[PDB]
Every structure is written in C-alpha cells, then in structure tokens.
Amino acid sequence: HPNAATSDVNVTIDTFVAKLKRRQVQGSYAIALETLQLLMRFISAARWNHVNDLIEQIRDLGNSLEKAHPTAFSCGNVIRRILAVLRDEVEEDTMSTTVVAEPLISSMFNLLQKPKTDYRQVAIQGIKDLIDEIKNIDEGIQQIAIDLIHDHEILLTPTPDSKTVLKFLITARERSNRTFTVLVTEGFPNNTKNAHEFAKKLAQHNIETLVVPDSAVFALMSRVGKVIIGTKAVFVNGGTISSNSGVSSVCECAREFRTPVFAVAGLYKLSPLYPFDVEKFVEFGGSQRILPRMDPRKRLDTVNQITDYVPPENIDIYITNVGGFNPSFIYRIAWDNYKQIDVHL
C-alpha cells in the first residue's frame, strides 16, 4: 500500500517520517504523543463506509509506519492498543447486528470453532484514554515503589536516561524516615552527560551521591543491595530494550552476586511483538565521538552501540501503573491491551 490515497486528506505522515529519520523527535513519550495525534487526524478527516476495510487500511498504515522506523516501539504499541479497542466494539456490534459462552475473559477453542453504529465516538474516546494513561505513570508506581527500599541499604543505578526512573528515585528520597546511599554508573559513549545531570539532580535533592566509573563496579559489589534499570521498551517473554549503554554487564554482575534486579517502565512501552533477534531491533551509534582523526581511523574500526538488550533471566520485577508484575506474567498484561490478530500487520 502506497501514499497515493492520502495526499490532501492527510499530509502529516511525511512530517512524522521526517521526524523519525533524522531524529528531530526525541523521547519515546513524545513519539507516542505524535502517533496519537496522527491517529486522531486520520479519524476526524477520512471516510469509511465499511468497517473491515477501514481496519485493513489502519493495519496497512501501521505497517508502513513500522517500515519507516523500527526502533519506535511506542508508536506501534499505541496503534495496536487502538486497534484492540476498536475490535472489541466491532465484536459487540456484530452480536447486535446478527440479532455465546466462555469460561474466562478469552478462549482458545473459539478460534478453532466457526463463529451502522456510533463506534467512531468510542474510537475517539479510546485515544483520549490512551493519552491520559501516557500522562501519568509515576502516580500508579509510587504506591508500590516506596515499599522496597529500606534504611542503611545501598542502591546501584545503571541507565539514568529515563525520565520515569529519576522521578521514582525522587519520590523514594522525599520520605524523611528513609535513608539510602546511591551508586551511579556513568556509561561512557552514550550516557555520560545524562549521568552527570542525574548526579547533579541527586545532589540538589540533598542525598548522598557516589559517581562511579564503568570499571569500578566490581569492587563495590559486596555492599550493593538493589539494582534498577532505566529501560525504554518492554516485550513478550520478559526481555527489555534499555535507554543506551552500560546495562548488560551490570545486570550480569548482579545475577552473579544474586542481587535483586528491578525494572520500572510502563505498559505503553510494552510490545506484543517478540524480540527474536538482538541485531534487528538494536540500533548502533556513532564512531566520530570516540576518537579524533580520519586517515589513521580507516585502520581503526571502532564499535559503539546506542540501545542495550538484557535477557529476561536476570530481571525479576516489572512495577507499572496497575501494579507489580513478573517477566513470567507480563505477556498476559500485553494480551489484555493488544488482541490476537493485531500482533501481525
């Protein structure tokens, strides 16, 4: 499906693509917001007449968006959620149009056995709901989050790039009765400035801050109590894509020492697609930032990557806005938000 049908009806797709390609848009939240806006635009302006055809068109659009940018998971996720929202309503409608038993909320045997309305408003409302959900995640985490950290315990923080994780930390630090020491890993080629900023923020907040280089993780590990990840995207089996540099090794270390590994992200970051390949989804950074000169640097081929992938075996906890979950359970949450056919587009 090409962009021959959408030219004067919807123009913003091109702009979105541009934003994606040259990285004019920054932060997954912003991307999600943009996607939502696009969806709204599609809904308010275009014509349908039929429902299945419309659904197909939407699917095609989603596919196109995916093809334009693979590292933008939030965009995909939101679309999927919207589709799911549509789908249930459609199913409900069909039952009235025609004019059923189930043990649970969803059935497996229903796939094997042979099975005009104001749905537009409902669809519109769905988008609004999604927006609302996106707006506040930290408020639904803090009631569970400020129960884990105790007095005279030491925290270790890889990936300070995420905006949620910092907030979570701050909320914990607010409490007068609670006291903890913070060890911060830098992350050289991608996270350094961000890490520094985080450290500064911590200092401002009036907490004991310890800036640790990437090599000095091993010596302090006898005192480490907990591990927190600043992840960017959540998946099916448990595996997560983290917000750039210095996460994997630390996680491995934690696993070795049997240190508890926590993860805070959200359900809008959660994807119903499987991360079958690390090489396909993980994007690599820039060689220019590491070392100067060009003519001797033709011989010196430098390897540097943005995003990081951590196996589900190391991570045990996934606290979101709903509540505390596991990597062995999060799949069901995704299913509760994205339907069966909506996985493949």
Partner: protein
C-alpha cells in the same frame, strides 16, 4: 527566516572522472547502490528548501526521466523540480548569467556546487548567517569548512591553504599547490592589503572542501557586473578579498565534525567507506530513503538488504554491504568491499578493499584488490587486478586477463587503453 529556494550546480565536473561520464549523466551514478542525487536532495530537505532548481545540459533527457520517476514529482512534496535547460558546455559564470536572465532569485538563495552529503545540522548555520547579515549591510556569501585528519597527505587536487580570523571567521588568502604530488612549487604567499586591520593572523592548511554556499541577492548581480569571473573559488574569493567592491564581508564556517564533497575517485572511495562506518551521525542505509529500499543492520558494520542470499562457510572481514537479489557461492574471502544489487558471485573469490556497482558477474577463481567495477560490466574466470583500476560501462572482461596498477578502461563504445568490447587489451580487439 522561512521560504528558501535551492539551485544545484549539476553536470559541471564531467571528464574529471576520466573513464566514465560519456553516455549517462554524472550525478545519476550510484554511490552505494543508490543514485547520488538522492542524498543531496535529502540534505537540502534537512536544511530547509521550498523550491528545487537543477542545471542540466549533458544527457538532460535521462535526468528529466529520473525526475519524473522520482518521489518529489508527486504533489506531497514541499519543493517542486523545474530544470534549467541550457546550451552545451559553459562555465559557472555563464550559468549564473543565464539564471539572472530568467529571474527567480529572491533573498537568501542556496547554491550548491557538486554533490555533498554531511551530518551537521543546518538550522544553526542559517541562524548564524542571518545574525552576521544583520551586523552590516554589505555581506555576501557563506563558505563551509571542516577540520581535517590532523596532517594532510591524501590531498593533492585541492589542498587550499586558508588564512583565517578567529573573531570574525573570514578568509584572507586562497592558494592551490601540487607540492605532495610533484615537488616543483613549494611556496606560500601573503597579500599585505589586510594586515593592519585583522591583527589576529591564523595561517592554516588542514581544512577540507565542502562547496555549499548560502548566497545573498547581491551575488548574481555581481556575476552579471564582472563577467571575467568564470569560476567561483579561485578567482572570485580572491577578487572579493582584494577589494573589487569596497567594504564587503564573506563567511568561513568552522565545524569539528565530518564534511567532505565528492571530487575524485580515491576521495569517493573514502567517502563511501565513511558512510559504511558510523562517521555520519544519522545518515544510514537501513532507514530506507528511496522507499523501494529494504536495507537492514547487522553486527560488525555489515549491511544486508532483503532477498540477499549468501552460501555457508565464507569468512568475512570488516565493513561489508550487499544489495538485493544477490547469489554468492562458497569459499569467498570478503574484506572492506561493497557488492551491488542483483550481482551473481561464483566460487573461490578473494576480495580486499574493492568496489562493485549494480548488476555485475564476478567469474570463478578471481582476485579483486582496491579496484572499481561499473554497472553492467562483467568479470570472467581468472582476472587479477591491482590498486586503483577503474572499469567503465558494459566492459566485457572475458577469460584469462592480468592488469597492472592504475589501469583505466574506457566507458563509451577513445584515447585511453582497453575498450568496451570482448577481452581487455592484452591481444588487440576493439573498434
């Protein structure tokens, strides 16, 4: 600040690429299995363009066809393509005059000479240009410069020595020397016209050419006025310096990041290598710009498109890119070389630092080293090539041939040895 037109100086540096540029246009040729114009267009878009103007003369019909086929022809584009058709063979002065005669020039117009692809953001540069313009009434044009690889040694064609100021960023002297290639003239001259006004004199050589110009409305008028200036770098800048029109300013923008224009063959190769690596920050093939492209990223700087087939047990080195529809056999050693789209590679072939264009057949038991093969030119069984051997259009290298260092092969079916017909010159066959 908004609404800016673009004029691209295309079909200007023909015969500079001595084997090629005879049948097909210069810019239409692929950089990395995809045309060179596209990159330029993308760059322009990034900068901020509202209307596109291209200068065509040599094989213009093909260019027109390409434009028709291209994505910007459809109404979704913010910028439309309208080509300037001119009589054959003229200098950049004449072209400028022609442009002036037509009359589309408004405000701060963009003039780009050749094809350039770089990673640096342009909005900031534009802002700087605006601010500097706002300083004094008689400000002319912007020049782009980047820091070189510490010491210059691979630069012989254009090793321009830029004497620059730190406070104002303005050029004082321009000079070209063939000193590293041929030791005949090793001399540096300084003109005393601007010694007692600048004071802060910084003499530099290690700066690479970009040839991207942000130009005011004065420039075409100036060109019309002084018809002696045929070129834009050697005579023009110097003239400006030596006070042709009194009390005027020019820009020389300095950037720490990578920015190099396409000029020769080795330089082109280097650019390609850079592109393959992570030198350019957002410019990667896996993003897919032409929409027909289906490139994907893999470990150790390896690019693979969709429908790429590679057989088992083949040890690969560093930095390799493969185009769509390829069939590669067994026992191959591939190192720092790009393979074109729909190319059929045989068995037991050792490749090091080479370059392969679109749709090429590489024969069984052959060695390729640091040499380029153009589109639809085929290599036969047992061909041994050395460093810097350019092969032209549709050249059929058949069974058993050996070619020494820096051997150039003709493209059109004249003066240089080895022709387009059967067997390259070891036994005399051709037109």
């Amino acid at each position: 600040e908004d609404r800016l037109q673009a004029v691209v100086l295309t079909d200007s540096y023909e015969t500079r690429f001595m084997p090629l540029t005879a049948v097909k246009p210069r810019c239409l040729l692929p950089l990395a299995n995809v045309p060179l114009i596209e990159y330029t267009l993308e760059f322009l878009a990034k900068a901020g363009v509202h209307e596109v103007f291209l200068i065509c003369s040599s094989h213009a019909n093909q260019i027109n066809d390409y434009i028709e086929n291209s994505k910007w022809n459809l109404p979704w584009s913010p910028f439309k393509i309208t080509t300037i058709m001119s009589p054959e063979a003229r200098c950049t002065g004449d072209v400028m005059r022609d442009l002036d005669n037509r009359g589309i020039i408004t405000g701060d117009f963009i003039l780009v000479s050749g094809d350039v692809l770089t990673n640096i953001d342009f909005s900031k540069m534009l802002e700087f240009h605006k601010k500097m313009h706002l300083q004094d009434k008689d400000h002319i044009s912007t020049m782009c410069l980047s820091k070189a690889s510490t010491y210059p040694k691979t630069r012989t064609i254009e090793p321009a020595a830029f004497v620059l100021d730190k406070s104002t960023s303005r050029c004082i002297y321009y000079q070209d020397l063939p000193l590293p290639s041929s030791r005949e003239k090793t001399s540096i001259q300084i003109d005393p016209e601007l010694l007692d006004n600048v004071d802060e004199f910084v003499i530099r050589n290690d700066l690479i050419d970009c040839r991207i110009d942000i130009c005011t409305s004065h420039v075409p008028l100036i060109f019309q006025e002084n018809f002696d200036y045929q070129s834009l770098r050697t005579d023009f800048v110097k003239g400006v310096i030596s006070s042709d029109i009194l009390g005027k300013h020019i820009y020389a923008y300095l950037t720490d990041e990578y920015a190099v224009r396409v000029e020769s063959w080795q330089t082109y190769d280097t650019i390609s290598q850079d592109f393959l690596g992570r030198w350019c920050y957002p410019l990667v093939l896996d993003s897919n710009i032409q929409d027909d492209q289906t490139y994907s990223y893999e470990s150790r700087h390896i690019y693979k498109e969709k429908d790429v087939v590679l057989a088992q047990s083949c040890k690969i080195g560093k930095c390799t890119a493969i185009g769509s529809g390829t069939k590669i056999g067994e026992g191959t050693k591939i190192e720092n070389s790009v393979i074109g789209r729909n190319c059929q590679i045989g068995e037991n072939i050792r490749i090091k630092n080479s370059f392969i264009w679109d749709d090429c057949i590489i024969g069984n038991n052959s060695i390729i080293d640091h040499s380029l093969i153009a589109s639809n030119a085929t290599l036969g069984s047992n061909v041994r090539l050395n460093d810097g051997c350019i092969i032209g259009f549709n050249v059929k290298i058949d069974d058993n041939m050996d070619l020494d260092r820096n051997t150039k092969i003709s493209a059109s079916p004249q003066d240089l040895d080895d022709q387009t017909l059967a067997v390259s010159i070891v036994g005399d066959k051709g037109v």
